[PDB]
Amino acid sequence: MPHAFKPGDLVFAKMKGYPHWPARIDDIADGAVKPPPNKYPIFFFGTHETAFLGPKDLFPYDKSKDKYGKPNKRKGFNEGLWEIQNNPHASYS
């Protein structure tokens, strides 16, 4: 059975106007800006941008990759597909 989301989990993350996007739940480093309550820090692969999202917009990667894990024209998307599959826990800073 599923647990709550935790740092390191791999997802497709959905935002308004963008396709379901390969991403991970990030850790929050000491000193770093914390998310709002009930929100997680989401690191988007390829673009390397961060946004704060709740679970309604987070689709676990294993379950969802057959649907959402296909090339897209959008900037950074296909780079992001490579990262999530090949080195999803690397430093992209």
Curated annotation (Swiss-Prot):
Annotated function: Acts as an epigenetic regulator of myogenesis in cooperation with DPF3a (isoform 2 of DPF3/BAF45C). Associates with the BAF complex via its interaction with DPF3a and HDGFL2-DPF3a activate myogenic genes by increasing chromatin accessibility through recruitment of SMARCA4/BRG1/BAF190A (ATPase subunit of the BAF complex) to myogenic gene promoters. Promotes the repair of DNA double-strand breaks (DSBs) through the homologous recombination pathway by facilitating the recruitment of the DNA endonuclease RBBP8 to the DSBs.
Organism: Homo sapiens
Tissue-by-tissue expression: Widely expressed. High expression is found in heart, skeletal muscle, ovary and testis. Overexpression is frequently observed in hepatocellular carcinoma samples.
Origin: domain of life: Eukaryota
Subcellular location: Nucleus; Cytoplasm
Description of how the protein assembles with itself and partners: Interacts with HDGF. Interacts with trimethylated 'Lys-36' of histone H3 (H3K36me3). Interacts with trimethylated 'Lys-79' of histone H3 (H3K79me3), but has higher affinity for H3K36me3. Interacts with IWS1. Interacts with H2AX, POGZ, RBBP8 and CBX1. Interacts with histones H3K9me3, H3K27me3 and H3K36me2. Interacts with DPF3a (isoform 2 of DPF3/BAF45C). Interacts with SMARCA4/BRG1/BAF190A, SMARCC1/BAF155 and SMARCD1/BAF60A in a DPF3a-dependent manner.
Family: Belongs to the HDGF family.
Signal peptide start and end residues: none
Gene name for this UniProt entry: HDGFL2
Full-sequence range covered: 1 to 93 of 671
Residues of the PWWP domain: 7-64
Name of this protein: Hepatoma-derived growth factor-related protein 2
